[PDB]
Amino acid sequence: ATALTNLVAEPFAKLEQDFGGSIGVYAMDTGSGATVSYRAEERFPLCSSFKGFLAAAVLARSQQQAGLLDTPIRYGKNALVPWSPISEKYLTTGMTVAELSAAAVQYSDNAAANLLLKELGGPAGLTAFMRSIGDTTFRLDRWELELNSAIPGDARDTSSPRAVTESLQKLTLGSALAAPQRQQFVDWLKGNTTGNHRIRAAVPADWAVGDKTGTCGVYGTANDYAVVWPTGRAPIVLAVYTRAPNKDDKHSEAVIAAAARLALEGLG
Numbered sequence: 001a002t003a004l005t006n007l008v009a010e011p012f013a014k015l016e017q018d019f020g021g022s023i024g025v026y027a028m029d030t031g032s033g034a035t036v037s038y039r040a041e042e043r044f045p046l047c048s049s050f051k052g053f054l055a056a057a058v059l060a061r062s063q064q065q066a067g068l069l070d071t072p073i074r075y076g077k078n079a080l081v082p083w084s085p086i087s088e089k090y091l092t093t094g095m096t097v098a099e100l101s102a103a104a105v106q107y108s109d110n111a112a113a114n115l116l117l118k119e120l121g122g123p124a125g126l127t128a129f130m131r132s133i134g135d136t137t138f139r140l141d142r143w144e145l146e147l148n149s150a151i152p153g154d155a156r157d158t159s160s161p162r163a164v165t166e167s168l169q170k171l172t173l174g175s176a177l178a179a180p181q182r183q184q185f186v187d188w189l190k191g192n193t194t195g196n197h198r199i200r201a202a203v204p205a206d207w208a209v210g211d212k213t214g215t216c217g218v219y220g221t222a223n224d225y226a227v228v229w230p231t232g233r234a235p236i237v238l239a240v241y242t243r244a245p246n247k248d249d250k251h252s253e254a255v256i257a258a259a260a261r262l263a264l265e266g267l268g
């Protein structure tokens with residue numbers, strides 16, 4: 001007999017009703033193949049969470065372009081947009097592609113993301129990379145900060161929790177990238193500074209976590225995806241996305257952490 005997905009799903013329904021919006025979850029146990037799924041194929045805005053996949057796309061390019069990560073990008077003052085706390089420090093020198101990638105992943109630096117998008121051929125270039133690994137759901141259409149608008153019913157700049165989780169697994173644990181690039185992606189995710197109150201909050205402190213967050217700032221729209229390495233066990237890959245119908249509906253980190261906990265506890 002197969003899983004009773006109604007019983008798996010029930011607690012997510014209760015959680016999203018108090019939240020006043022929709023919660024989307026996909027979790028994959030790479031040990032057993034067990035999954036947890038709730039609204040996992042619905043679209044949610046990516047917000048800043050696209051930046052993890054952007055760094056993966058840069059790493060893929062570096063396999064064809066030797067030394068790409070070492071390349072200085074010497075940007076002007078009009079690169080600087082709000083929530084660019086790392087790139088704003090280095091206007092007088094520029095930053096390397098590697099530094100920009102780390103900043104985009106770990107501080108969610110907006111200018112760094114825009115500069116890296118320009119290097120990859122814009123939002124279309126990132127989307128094309130995702131298509132190359134079999135992700136047909138992901139789409140990035142716009143740049144920072146317009147991509148954060150999160151308008152209900154807008155398909156631009158969205159993916160699904162399932163697609164995010166599947167692509168994350170391919171890139172961090174599968175061999176979609178060469179081993180050095182794969183480990184670099186993992187290390188950038190592990191050094192994230194913005195995720196302590198989201199999936200990380202549901203995970204025992206002695207287990208390694210790599211994640212990337214997103215917070216659109218409107219429409220109760222925020223998210224996190226992660227790889228979790230339980231000690232002596234196969235890793236877990238998961239994504240938690242939220243949205244809500246009114247522009248002034250609050251996002252909630254606690255709701256993301258709670259959904260992450262329900263997903264993690266429900267596996268296998």
Ligand SMILES: *C(=O)N1C[C@H](NOS(=O)(=O)O)CC[C@H]1C#N
Pocket residue numbers: 047048049083107108109110145148194213214215216217
């Ligand atoms: C991305 O969604 N961002 C970047 C900045 N940080 O938030 S995050 O949750 O760490 O990604 C502020 C919110 C928004 C923008 N712009």
